[PDB]
C-alpha cells in the first residue's frame with residue numbers, strides 16, 4: 001500500500017494549516033476532501049457571506065441618510081452579487097491545489113472512513129499513515145421530522161440563482177439572523193422560527209434585545225418557543241408546521257432553510273473501527289489535541305471537542321498546535337487567547353470574554369457597565385438607532401473579563417477589547433489612552 | 449476666581465468641568481459659541497459630511513457587482529444634517545457649565561478680571577496669508593458652512609485638511625485643485641504610503657500641483673485667478689472659491705503675551721513638564737495653544753487638560769505623559785499612522801526591522817473593490833515591539849488604534865501573531881503585517 005508521514009481528513013483551515021506546515025518540514029503529506037479544497041469558511045461560509053453583506057451595507061447606509069444627504073436608496077442586484085461572490089469561491093480551490101503541488105502534497109478527492117487504527121478507505125485505496133489528522137469540521141444537523149429533507153442548507157443560501165420571494169430560517173443563532181438580514185435587505189419576506197425562549201441564547205440578552213428590535217424594524221417576523229414538526233410541498237412553495245405551548249401555526253414560504261446547530265462531521269468516519277474516543281461534541285482530545293485513546297490520531301477545529309469556539313481562527317490556532325506535536329513530538333499544549341465572535345447582522349453584534357452571568361458562575365468579584373447610547377455622536381452621525389455596550393471588569397485586578405457590543409463597526413472594535421484582555425491592560429490605562437477621533441474605537445474609554 | 453480659562457474648547461471644557469466638581473470657583477470665556485474648533489468648525493462637522501460621500505464611494509466600488517445606481521450627494525440636506533449637530537452643541541455646554549456653578553462669559557500684566565491661576569486654551573487660528581489677495585481665500589470653517597457647493601474649488605495646502613476637503617468636494621461633483629508649496633504632499637507621513645493616496649486622489653479627478661508658491665489671488669466677476677510660481681513658470685488657476693488650507697498657527701499672537709512676561713515661540717506658549725509656563729508660574733496652557741510634545745489632536749487637547757486641571761487642583765504633582773498619538777487623514781481611502789516613521793526611528797538610532805507591502809490583492813481590499821491597500825510597520829529588533837505603523841485602505845481610522853494599544857502595552861510581535869481576531873474583519877490582517 002501507500003505509507004504517509006501525515007494523512008489529513010479534510011482540507012479546511014485546520015487541514016490546510018497542518019498540510020502546508022508539515023509538508024515544508026519535509027514530511028510526506030496525503031490530504032483528502034469529499035468536496036473541493038478550501039473549507040467551510042472559504043467556499044460556503046464566512047468569505048462568501050461577507051462579500052454578499054457588502055452590497056446590503058451600501059443599501060443600509062443610503063437608507064440611513066435618506067433625506068439627510070442621499071436621495072436614491074440602491075436596490076441590491078441579487079444576480080450580479082452572486083457572480084461577484086462566485087469569482088471568490090471559484091478561485092480558492094485551484095489556489096489551494098497550486099500550493100499543494102508546490103509542496104509535495106498528494107491530493108485525494110474522495111470521502112474517508114477508518115478501516116483500522118492506521119488505515120483509511122480513500123475511494124478504492126487503502127492508505128496507511130504514521131500520524132492521521134481529523135479536520136472534517138462540522139456538517140448541517142439532519143432535521144429528524146416529517147419533511148426535514150426539504151430544508152435547504154447554509155451552502156444552498158450562498159448559491160441561490162434567484163432570491164426567493166419569502167424565506168423561513170429554522171434556527172435562532174448567528175446564521176439565521178445574518179441570512180434573515182441579507183434576504184430582507186435584498187427585498188424578500190423573511191421569518192425566523194426558533195425553539196427557544198431567547199434568540200442567540202449564548203450572547204448577553206441586554207445586547208441581543210437591540211438586535212431583535214432592529215430585526216423587527218427590517219420586516220423580519222421572529223417566531224420564538226416553536227418546534228417545527230413538519231414541512232409539506234404545497235405547489236412550488238412549502239407549508240411549515242410549528243407547535244408552541246398549546247397552539248399550532250402554519251407558515252408559507254418559497255424556500256425553508258436549516259439554520260440549526262452544526263454537529264461535528266465525525267459520525268461517518270467509522271471512528272469505533274480505530275479505537276478513537278469521541279462524544280456528541282466531536283473527537284475527544286487531550287491538552288496536545290491528541291486523541292485520548294489512539295495516539296496516532298490528532299483533531300483540530302469544529303471536528304474536535306476542544307475549549308475552542310467554532311471559529312476560523314481557532315481552527316488555525318489548533319492547526320499550528322497539532323502540526324507542532326506531529327513534526328517535533330508532544331511538546332506544545334494548546335493555549336487560547338480571547339476568542340472574539342461577531343454576528344454579521346446590521347447593526348453587527350460582537351462579544352469577547354465572559355458574560356455577566358458566566359463571570360458570577362465562576363465567583364469573580366465584578367463591575368458591570370451596561371449602557372444604551374443611541375444618542376452618542378457615532379450612532380447619530382451614521383443614523384444607526386441601536387448602539388449599546390456591556391463591559392465586565394474584575395474588581396480585584398481592574399482588568400476586563402469581557403465586552404459585548406451592538407452598533408456601527410463592533411466587528412472591528414471588539415478586537416480592541418480582545419487585545420486589552422490578552423495584555424491585562426488596567427481599566428485606567430485604556431481610559432487615558434489616545435485614540436484616533438472621530439472613530440468608534442474612541443468610544444471605548446467611555447464604556448468603562 | 450480660583451481658575452479663569454480663555455476658550456471653551458476641548459481643553460477649556462475639560463479643565464473647567466474637572467475643577468468645578470472639586471468645589472473651586474470657575475470663570476470661563478470664549479467669543480464664539482461654546483464647543484471649540486473640533487465640535488463646531490472641525491472634526492465633528494467634517495465627519496458628518498464625509499458620511500454621505502462614503503455612501504456614494506461604496507455604491508460605485510460595487511457598481512456592476514451588486515449595485516446598479518450610484519447616489520448623488522445632496523449638498524443642501526447634509527449641510528442641514530451637519531448644522532443640527534453644530535447648533536445643538538453650544539446650548540449643551542451651557543447646561544453643563546450652569547449645572548456646576550461655572551460663570552459663562554462670551555467676550556474675547558502678570559495676572560490681569562484677575563484670578564489666582566489662569567489657563568490659555570485658545571487653540572489655533574487659520575494662518576493669515578500675507579500676499580496680494582490673501583484675504584479672498586476662505587477659512588476651512590467656511591467650507592463647512594457653504595450654502596451651495598461651488599463648481600470648482602482650489603486648496604492652498606499639502607496637509608490633512610486640504611486633502612480631506614478635496615475628497616469631499618470631488619465626490620460631491622466639483623472640479624478640484626490642490627496647490628502645494630512643498631516637494632511632497634503630507635510631508636510628515638511615510639511617503640511609501642502617501643503615494644497610494646496621491647494615486648487614488650488623481651483617479652478621483654483632482655489636480656495635485658507640487659513645488660508651487662501662491663503669490664496672488666485676483667477676483668474677476670464670480671471667479672478667482674490664483675497665480676503660482678515654480679522653478680520655471682508662473683502658471684495661473686481659475687475657481688469659484690479658493691480655500692486657506694495652509695497650516696494653523698497657535699491662537700496667542702493677539703493676547704499681548706509680552707504684557708505678562710509669558711515665554712512663547714511661533715509654535716505656541718512655551719511650557720515645562722507640568723504644562724506651566726517656563727516664565728510666569730500663575731499661567732498654564734493646553735491644546736493647539738501650547739508648544740507641547742503633543743500632536744495637534746482633540747484627544748491630546750483633553751489629555752493636556754486633565755494634567756493642567758490636576759496641578760491646579762492639588763498643586764504641581766503631575767508631569768504630562770503622552771501615550772501613542774494615532775492620527776488619521778479622513779480621505780477615501782483613509783490614511784492612518786501612529787508612532788515613528790522609518791526615518792524618525794533611524795534618527796533616534798533604534799535598530800529597526802521594516803515591513804512594507806502593497807496588498808490591493810488581499811480579500812479585504814478585493815471584496816470592497818478598494819484598489820489602495822498598503823501598510824508599513826516599524827519594529828525595534830531588540831525588544832521585538834512595534835515602534836510605528838502606517839496604513840492606507842479600508843477602516844484604517846479604526847485599525848490604527850490596535851497598533852496604538854500594541855505600542856502602549858509593549859506587546860511582543862509574536863503575541864500579536866498568536867492573537868485571535870474577529871474574522872472576516874480588517875483587524876484580522878494585522879498579524880500578516882508584522
Ligand SMILES: Cc1cc2nc3c(=O)[nH]c(=O)nc-3n(C[C@H](O)[C@H](O)[C@H](O)COP(=O)(O)OP(=O)(O)OC[C@H]3O[C@@H](n4cnc5c(N)ncnc54)[C@H](O)[C@@H]3O)c2cc1C
Nearest residue numbers: 010012013014034039040041112136137301302310311312
Ligand atoms: C455559513 C457559515 C458562516 C460562518 N461564518 C463564520 C464567520 O464569520 N467567522 C468565523 O470565524 N467562523 C465562521 N464560520 C465557522 C467557520 O467556517 C468554521 O469554524 C471553520 O471553517 C472550521 O474549519 P475546519 O477546518 O474545522 O472545517 P472546514 O474548514 O469546514 O473543513 C472541513 C473539510 O472537511 C471535509 N470533510 C468533512 N467530512 C469529511 C469526510 N468524512 N471525508 C473527507 N472530507 C471530509 C469538508 O468537505 C471540508 O472541506 C461559519 C460557518 C458557516 C457554516
Ligand SMILES: Cc1cc2nc3c(=O)[nH]c(=O)nc-3n(C[C@H](O)[C@H](O)[C@H](O)COP(=O)(O)OP(=O)(O)OC[C@H]3O[C@@H](n4cnc5c(N)ncnc54)[C@H](O)[C@@H]3O)c2cc1C
Nearest residue numbers: 455457458459478484485486490491571735736744745746
Ligand atoms: C478642519 C479641522 C479638522 C480637524 N480634524 C481633526 C480630526 O479629525 N481629528 C482630530 O483629532 N483633530 C482634528 N482637528 C484638530 C482639533 O480641532 C483641535 O486639535 C482641537 O480643537 C483642540 O482643542 P483646543 O482646546 O486646543 O482648541 P479649540 O477648542 O479649537 O479652541 C477653543 C476656542 O478658543 C476660542 N478663542 C480663540 N481666541 C480666543 C480669545 N482671544 N479669547 C477667547 N476665546 C478665544 C476659539 O474661538 C475656539 O473656539 C481638526 C481641526 C480642524 C481645523
